[PDB]
Amino acid sequence: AQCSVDIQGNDQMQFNTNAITVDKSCKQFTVNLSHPGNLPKNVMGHNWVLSTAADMQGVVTDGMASGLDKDYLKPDDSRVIAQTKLIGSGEKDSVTFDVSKLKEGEHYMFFCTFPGHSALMKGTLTLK
Numbered sequence: 001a002q003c004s005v006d007i008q009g010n011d012q013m014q015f016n017t018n019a020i021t022v023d024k025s026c027k028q029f030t031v032n033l034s035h036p037g038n039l040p041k042n043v044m045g046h047n048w049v050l051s052t053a054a055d056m057q058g059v060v061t062d063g064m065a066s067g068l069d070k071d072y073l074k075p076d077d078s079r080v081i082a083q084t085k086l087i088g089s090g091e092k093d094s095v096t097f098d099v100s101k102l103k104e105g106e107h108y109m110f111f112c113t114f115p116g117h118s119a120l121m122k123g124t125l126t127l128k
């Protein structure tokens, strides 16, 4: 029984988990992201973004084009189910979303949209 998860993004461009599980009982789910690194947001910034596996590449590509000022995320991206802000060393940010937005049978992935990061900083979020 739980409806939250704590996640860390470090100076080595890694999340401390590649798989998140969400209990179907949860009406809402919360992700608590933190950055235990010493590097600045402009060189090793991280955010936690959720979308379907099929929408990831698009969110990432458009995110990079949107730039640092937009936390590397296209404004009001309909493909984004949930998103934290872009954080740097010592920062934290939480995001809560409705579990109803997730439909079983569908593949969901979480990732960081800072340029190049999704290559390593990505994982699955499933609902069972």
Ligand SMILES: Cc1ccnc2c1ccc1c(C)ccnc12
Pocket (backbone or CB within 6 Å): 107
């Ligand atoms: C890697 C991968 C890509 C796409 N779909 C899938 C997988 C792996 C497992 C899986 C299962 C168990 C059910 C439905 N789709 C997939």
Ligand SMILES: [Cu+2]
Pocket (backbone or CB within 6 Å): 009, 013, 044, 045, 046, 047, 112, 113, 114, 117, 121
């Ligand atoms: Cu990152």
